Each structure stands twice: as structure tokens, then as C-alpha cells.
Amino acid sequence: SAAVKEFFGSSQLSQFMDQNNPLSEITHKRRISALGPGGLTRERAGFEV
Amino acid sequence: NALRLHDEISQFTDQMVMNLADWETLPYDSFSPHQDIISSRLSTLYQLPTMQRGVLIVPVNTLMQRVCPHSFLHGHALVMKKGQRLSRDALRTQLDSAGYRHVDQVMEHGEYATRGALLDLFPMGSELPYRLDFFDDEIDSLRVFDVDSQRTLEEVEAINLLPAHEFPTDKAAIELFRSQWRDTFEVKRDPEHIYQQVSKGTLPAGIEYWQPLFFSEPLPPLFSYFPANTLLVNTGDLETSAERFQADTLARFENRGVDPMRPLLPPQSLWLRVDELFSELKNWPRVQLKTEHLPTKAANANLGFQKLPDLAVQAQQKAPLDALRKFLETFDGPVVFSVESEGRREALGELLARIKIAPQRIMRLDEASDRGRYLMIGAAEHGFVDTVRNLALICESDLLGERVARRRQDSRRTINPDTLIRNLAELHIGQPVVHLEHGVGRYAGMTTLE
Amino acid sequence: RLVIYEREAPEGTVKDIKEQEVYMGEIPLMTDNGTFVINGTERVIVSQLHRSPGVFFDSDKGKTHSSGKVLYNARIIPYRGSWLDFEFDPKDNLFVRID
Amino acid sequence: VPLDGGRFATSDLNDLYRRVINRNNRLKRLLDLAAPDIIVRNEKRMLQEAVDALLDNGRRGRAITGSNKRPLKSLADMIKGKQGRFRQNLLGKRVDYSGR
Amino acid sequence: SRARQKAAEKVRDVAAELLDIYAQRAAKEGFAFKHDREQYQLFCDSFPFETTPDQAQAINAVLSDMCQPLAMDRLVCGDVGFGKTEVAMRAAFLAVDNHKQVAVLVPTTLLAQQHYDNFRDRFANWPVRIEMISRFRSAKEQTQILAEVAEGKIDILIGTHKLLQSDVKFKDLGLLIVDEEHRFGVRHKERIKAMRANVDILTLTATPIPRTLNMAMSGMRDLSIIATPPARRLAVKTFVREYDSMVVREAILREILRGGQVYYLYNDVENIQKAAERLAELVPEARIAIGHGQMRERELERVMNDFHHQRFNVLVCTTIIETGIDIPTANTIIIERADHFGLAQLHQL
DNA sequence: ACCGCTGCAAGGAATAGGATACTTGCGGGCTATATGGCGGCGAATACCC
DNA sequence: GGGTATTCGCCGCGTACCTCTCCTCCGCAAGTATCCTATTCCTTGCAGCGGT
RNA sequence: CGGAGAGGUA
Ligand SMILES: Nc1ncnc2c1ncn2[C@@H]1O[C@H](COP(=O)(O)OP(=O)(O)OP(=O)(O)O)[C@@H](O)[C@H]1O
Ligand SMILES: [Mg+2]
């Protein structure tokens, strides 16, 4: 329960739903983040990625 | 047993009972013998060719081992106390065999002098020359004099220059070790192989078990170190424990006769073989102490040494001291109580007051009378009724015989009562059932499991 | 389902076997849409796009050594574990590095 | 400052100061007691490390941390950087009588 | 399930009790013992050793603190096997030579038995009657020891927690020697100070538990470390290996063929019988006995007596031997599962 | 009517299962390892004389 | 020694504003020490019991 | 008030 609640509650890829539309919800669920654990960093990503 | 005997014997006499401090390692082990030990394993060996009285206790673990073979001892050492009644020219010829040079102005290693009455040495071991002053076939001084100024710094009574390693460690001996190595073993190029470890100057962990290489003369069987007239007293049996130790040594040799890194000599090279050991115990006059009725002949005798009667106490009876109170009236001979420590005497002095017996304290066992209770302090472990001279020794472990509890209570099981449990299965489903360990459950059918 | 062996029997027997529906873990349930409810606040876990575990042969296009020398390198990238890298010194050697 | 739950904020400077004061008082007592040198030596090593971490943490390859495994904020970390005093409170600062 | 039924009411406040104990402590003037030079010189001469120049410093501090009008409270933190106990005896002599009823408090039965034997050994001529009260002594021995103590004839009383059980009323208590205090909690250490406030406490330990180490480092108690290991002690060689039957066998044979004895610490009572059987099948050459504090105690008496008399070599034991069992022949401990043990625990073992 | 010997038998003692208090660790606990940067620079080895 | 090469750790990397959540104690296991009933088992104290 | 993290406007 700890290892699962930690991931669901407080992670970089479990984020607060944008909910001022149906479109915003349905296009925030189909999101492809290139960040998070095991991935690159926001301000240290070059011009090619 | 040896350790135990070293405490028991010292109780019944006063001669210098002393062990022979063995390498506490196991055969072909991986640990060093802890140099302090060697400082007491060599010193014994240097006195052993002339000890005039006393008892030296060795087990067969050490008795079967080989030790430094002469030379190195009367060459690389000098132990000498003031009570060494020895002349000048005897030291002269022994230093001659030691290779020291007669120098009147002793300044460097391997130098000695015998002028007038005073004898000088600059030993192999230290960097200080010493003045000796033999008078009238005896040594009289230990004057630490300068390398050049010849002025005494300190007068000492006993001098100890022993090698701090069991084998020679100088450059010539290292070269000899390497040469014997290339003779027998094979060198591999690795900074951990003991050939390169010794060559670089360091001594490996278990280096003592490569002892015989360093010397180029076979290690003497330790019996050459014995005096002219000893009298080997045995204990138990030897033609049974030597064989057991030889088997265990062979087991260790084959167990570690793997690991091409760090290879091993054969056990013949660092241990007597049991055949040789009994080739040599036919070269000393011997007395065996064995605990069983030997029939009748010369070179055989029987010493009536019966065991004690049933002596025990317990708080169960209202009279706890019954065995003793009834034994100590029916005994014409003396009785010696051999309590363990000092304080235990009081813990035994207030218990024999309960039956009006006050033991004197004697020192040597042959102070006992016809009729008396005495106690002596030592470390003996079991009693005996010496029915030869009628005496008895009641060690404190013969007042605390045994413990016999845990005799339980009747019935931990019931068989064939209300429910036989014959059980050629017929039971229905839902029918209550009793497991003996967990209580009542409901039988819910056969099943198959992995 | 917990099996229990007995000691003095040969290697592999059974004394008892006890089973019990043990409770372990609370796993949050995705709603009918794709949103979880984690503390009353409705969260969404977005998909992540990361380099696949495997082995990759890259090269800095002469970014170092100023010779125009391309320093080819390889990464063995596990899904879970410690990485592994091989690279080339500008002297056309071959060196490994771990983590 | 209270966290409004009855307890107080961490305030890393006071944590570093408590660490230094604790080690220093312990070493003063242990020097009063004429303790053996093997003990006072690593006591002084600990005190040196503590004052080190107070003045500038992270200038050693090792940095000591509290929560979340990030190193504490030392007195040199309160001047350096984009969030120090110079660049965030002295060169440009928040201002009254302002709107947006 | 039922183990969680208990608690959460903090049934007793401890702060008020501890504050009142200390407040009664700091008010009453101490006892200022009388020191007789020669009559303690003989006690020193009975010591068959030499006091190392730090042990003889701790002893001098303890005596010059007992002979002051205040109340001692001293910690004698010194590394294991450095002769901390003889400090207790040379303070116990000063105490009981003024007819003052020392009370030694040890946190286990085997240590109680060992200290009883050692104290009878050391006080083997001086008319001081030493007695031990624990669960070894049966209920017709305790009911006499307590009457003796109350009438004031027993002059040293060595005891486990049975000592501090509210039925033990000393006549004139004058010195309390906590031994191995990295146990006992707090209330046990204070339950004897509470009845008599101005009593002198001599707290012996090797690894003091953090509360009473901080409280010594802040001046509340004194502290007198012991260094300079006594005569010929060698630092014990520690080896950390994955468990291996060959390692166990080699270690055991190396000790046994030397003649010493082995503590094989196992620390699991239910499986210790099977562990001893497995060990005796692994090493046929050894003689093996089981020792743990959950036997009929007339069996534990016998086991640890026989161990002291070399009647067996290997002692498969729990952490009942964690508290200062001497046995100077035993020279190999084998901690079976050392991963779950504290640093202090591992050091004492 | 006197006596040793034993059977009943009351209790006495030891032996179990249950409860309580310390020490220890473990493990998560509502303000207590990651591997997906790169460029400049000047100081510290290092390499080739 | 001394001139030049290579590597290594520290330094740096935009401004202003807005919105959101989430952040240790307290149970388990081992050991120790004690205490507390209920059950049963020696143990002898007394009565019987036939013999003298 | 601090810390970690997510996103958004110009
Ligand atoms: N100054 C000394 N020189 C040589 N031996 C000593 C000296 N002091 C004590 N010893 C011996 O060392 C052993 C240490 O045991 P002791 O109980 O006295 O201290 P300890 O074991 O550290 O105390 P604890 O039993 O609480 O651990 C004792 O057998 C004692 O005889
Ligand atoms: Mg002690």
C-alpha cells in the first residue's frame, strides 16, 4: 500500500487533471510525457529531442 | 586433557609443571601463530636439552609435530639467567659453532670476545653488545655496554634474545626458501602467490606451515630435544590418538590439496608419521597410566583406586546431607575434600558445618592422618577412594551428581475413546471433526494438491 | 496457501497445508474514464515515452577531441538494473564504464 | 516559524547550529575528562565536519541531508546563486504601491 | 489479533515520578564513607593482578567520590573485558566495611550466578555474607534471604530484577551497583533509588544506552572511562561471511583442537533443539549442549556449570550470554544470524 | 494393650499456559540513487623529454 | 628539472505572473526478566491393621 | 515559512 500510494499520490507522472472541458480531459489522458523517472530533464533537453 | 592436567598436577606437587605452547592453528590453516606464542615456544625448546627437574606436558598434537632442527636454536638465540653455572670456553666454542668472530672491540653482528674474566658479545639479533663476567664456572653480570665506548648502561640478571619468527628470516634463508620452492613446487606469476610474497619480504598468513623449506636440513622429530634421561609418562592411549590425528591431517591435506594458489607440503614433511612416532617411543623409558584392571606381570602393576560411593545431595529430602553423613562415619581413613576455588571453600565450609565437620586446610596430599577431614584447593575434577592407603578424595563434582527431572506427567494422548477415528473414510460433508492440535473443524471433502 | 514440511521425513513431504484469504494492499481503481481519485482530487497518470531497454550504438559527431574524430560508443540499457557503456578514447582505444 | 499543527519548521540553519553545538559541548566535556586520544581524535574530526557543513555544505564531495535526501542549506548557500541575497533581495526586490 | 487490544491509555505519567525521584535525590545529603588505609590495603593485596593505570584511576575516582558528603552517580563506561568488575569490588569493600549493605543489580540469571561466585571468591575471608536472589533460588530460599536482608545480616545482595520487587527491604542500603545497564529500562534503574534517595550508585557498563550516555556527557552523572587493555588481551578478529557449513566446521575444529570452547550463538528458542542436533551431526568431534533461559532452570544451572568445567565444548546459546559471561577459555563465538543485532549487541557478543 | 509397616490422603511442590515489563530489530510513518547536459576555465596530475 | 597534454571539478545556464498536491509511528517478530493461576505428582503425616 | 513536484500565461 505504501509503494502504490506513493506512486499514485506523489509522482511526476500522476498529475492533477485539467478539467475545464471535455476536450482538455480527453487530451490530457492521451498525453505522452517524455519526462518523469527514467527520462530526460526539462531544462537540459537539447534541440534534437 | 593436557590443559586439564596442567591444573590438576600443580595441585598435588610443586615441581615446575609447564606446557609447550603449540601453534593454536589447525593443520594447513590460514592463520599465523600470534608471535607472542613463538616467544614461549622457542624458549621452552632452548631449556629443554638441560632441564634437570620438572614436568613438561605435551599432547600428541604437538608430539607428532616436527620442530626447529638444532642449529638455528643454538645459533640464533641466547637465553641466560644469572644462575647459569657455565664457564668461559664453553660459551667460546658454542659461539664458535654460532660463527661469531673473536673481536676485542665488538661493534657489529656475529662478534664475541673472551678476555680475562669478562666475555663480550654483539649478537645476531640486537644492536647492543653485552658484557658477561663469568666467575668460577658461572655467569655473574649482564652489562649493557656501548658499541664503542665499552661503558655499561645497565646491569641485568636474565637475557633473552630469541628470534621473533620460528624460521630464519634473513636474506640467505629467503634465498634458500625460494630455491627449495623451485625444487619442489612450481612458481606462478601472481602478486598473491607465497613465493612472490616471501620474495617481496612479507610473510603470508599461514606461513608457518611452509616451515621445512627454510632450513635445508630435515626437521628433527622433537625427541632430539629431550634430555638424556626423561621418563615419558603417558595418559589414556597413544596408538589410538596418533592415528586419529594422522587421518585428520591427511583429510586436511587433501581438502586443501586443491587451490593451485598456495600449495602444500606432504604431511610427512611437517609431521611425524605414526610409524616413526612409535619407532621413537621405543627409545624412551615409559610409564602408562590406564584406568582398567591389568592382569598380572612384571612391568605391570595395580593400584587399588576405587571409585567413590554414591555421593550426592539434593534439597528434596529433609536430610540433604545423607550420603555424606553416612559415608563419613563408616570411613576409617582420612578424607580430603579438594574444593575448587578459594571462595568455594566457604561455600563448602558452611555446608559441612551442617553436619558438624570442620575441615582443616592442608597443602600437600600426604599431610593426611589416619582419621581426619581436610580440604585442599586445586582443580581436581573427580574423586577416588584410594583403598591402598585408605585415603579418599571427594571432589566438589561428587556432591552434585545429576539432574533427573522432566519425568513428565501421565497421558498426552487418549486412544479409542468417544471417537475411534478408525476412519476408513465414510464421513459426510459438514460433519464436525477434531484435529488433535487445532481443535474442531468441518470436514469438507477430499482434494488434490501440489 | 502455506505448506509446512516435516523434518525427519525425506526431502519433500507435507505435514499440514493452511490456506487463508489474506488481505494485502489497497490498489486505487481507475474510474470509468481513465481518471483516478487519490485523495478526493481527480488525477491522471500520463503515458511516458522513454528509451527502450536494449543496446544502442551512438557517437558524438566529433563534439570532442577537435580532430573530427568520431568517438563511437555503446550503451546496454536494462529495464531494471545497472547500465553498461563502452566508448573510444580519441587514441582509438576501447574502455568500459559502469553506472 | 510554527507549521500551524503544533510543531515547528525545520529551518536548516538552526539544525546545523544544533549539530555544531552538540559536538562542541561533547568534545569539551570529553577533553575535561582527559579521555584517550583515539576518542578525542574522531570527536575533533566530527566537530570539524560539522563546522564545515555549517559554513558551506556541499563544497565537500559528501553533503549531509535531512528530509527528501537533499543537502541542507548552509550559510554560504544563502548568498550564492539565483536565489541568494544578492540576486533575489538586494539587486531587485518586491515593492509596495504596485499593481498588475 | 488480541495483542493490539492492550494499551494506548498511557496508564501512568512517568515525568512526575522521575522528577520527584531526582528532586528527592538532590535534596538529601549523601553519606561520606570512612576509608581505612591498611584495612583496604589487604583487600588490594588479595587481588592477583595489577591495576592498569586507567583502572587504578577509575578506582581512585570512585573512592574519592564515595568519601565525599555528596551522593555519587557515576558511569564506568569501559571496553569489554577491561576489568570493570574489580572497580565494583574495590568500591564494594569500601561500602561494606562501614556495615552498609551493597546491592548489586545484574540483568540476567547467569550473570547473577557468575557474580555470586566471583564475589564469594573475592570476599573469601572478610566476614561479609554474600547472597544471590533470582529465579534460581527457590521460594524457601528467597523467603529466608529476604528475612536476612531486612534484619540486616546479608551484606551484599546480588540479584536480577527480582531484587526490585517491592518486597525486598534493605536495612541500611549504602551502595547500588548496576551492572550491564544497557538494559533495565529506566524504571528498574530508579526503583531502588526511589526507596532510598541518598544512596550511592556505581553504574558499570561497556556500551551505555544513549540516554545514560548523553546524561553522562552533560554533567548530570560523572563519567570515568577505562582504556589501556589489561595485560595480554588481543583485539578479537572479526570475520563476516555468508553462512557456510564448511566455515562453521573449520571454525569449530580450530577452536576445539586448541582445547578452548565455543559459543555458538543461535538466538531462536523453538528451533534451537534442531539447530543443536544439526550441529552435532555436522561436527561429530565436538560435545554440544544447549543453553537458553527457558528451561527448568535446574537444567540451566547444570548446563552453565558444566560449561565452566569444560565438560562440553560447544554451547548452542541464545543472547543470554550477551551480558558478561566470563569463561576465560571460550575463544570463539559464532553468531548464527548476525544481520539482526544492534551495534551494542554485536559488541557485547 | 504394644509395634512396625503401609494405604489414604492432605498439601506441597513442581509444572504447564496466560500476562506484563525491559532491551533489540523492522518498517512505514498526514512538513521527515540515478544512468536522457554541455561548454569554459584553471588547477592538478601526467607525459615526454 | 621543465614544456606541454590531458583530465577533473567548479562555475554558469531569462524575466514577471498564475493555478494545483504532498511532506513522521506504531504495530509486529526475537530475546530477557518477572508475576499469575490451575493440574498433577511426590511426600510424608496420620490412621489403620493385623501381628505379639 | 520551507522543501519536492506538476502545469499554464506573455
Ligand atoms: N588490571 C588487570 N590486569 C590483568 N587482568 C585483569 C585486570 N583487571 C581485571 N582482569 C581480569 O580480566 C577479566 C575481566 O573480567 P571482569 O568481569 O573483571 O571485567 P569485565 O568482564 O569487563 O566486566 P563484565 O563482566 O561486566 O564484562 C577478569 O577475569 C579479571 O580477572
Ligand atoms: Mg560486570
PDB file of N, CA and C and ligand atoms in Angstrom, chain E residues 85 111 115 179-180 204, ligand 2:
ATOM      1  N   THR E  85      34.728  -4.965  36.586  1.00  0.00           N
ATOM      2  CA  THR E  85      34.089  -5.561  37.750  1.00  0.00           C
ATOM      3  C   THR E  85      34.934  -5.358  38.997  1.00  0.00           C
ATOM      4  N   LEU E 111      24.473 -14.227  34.648  1.00  0.00           N
ATOM      5  CA  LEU E 111      25.367 -13.209  35.171  1.00  0.00           C
ATOM      6  C   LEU E 111      25.225 -13.090  36.674  1.00  0.00           C
ATOM      7  N   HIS E 115      28.395 -13.598  39.098  1.00  0.00           N
ATOM      8  CA  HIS E 115      28.810 -12.586  40.050  1.00  0.00           C
ATOM      9  C   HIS E 115      28.739 -13.100  41.466  1.00  0.00           C
ATOM     10  N   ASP E 179      24.999  -3.324  37.021  1.00  0.00           N
ATOM     11  CA  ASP E 179      25.960  -3.939  36.129  1.00  0.00           C
ATOM     12  C   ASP E 179      25.238  -4.212  34.827  1.00  0.00           C
ATOM     13  N   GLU E 180      25.920  -3.964  33.714  1.00  0.00           N
ATOM     14  CA  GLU E 180      25.339  -4.059  32.376  1.00  0.00           C
ATOM     15  C   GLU E 180      24.025  -3.293  32.295  1.00  0.00           C
ATOM     16  N   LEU E 204      28.008   0.394  36.061  1.00  0.00           N
ATOM     17  CA  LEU E 204      29.014  -0.260  35.239  1.00  0.00           C
ATOM     18  C   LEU E 204      28.409  -0.650  33.908  1.00  0.00           C
TER      19      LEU E 204
HETATM   20 MG    MG I   2      30.161  -6.638  35.242  1.00  0.00          MG
END
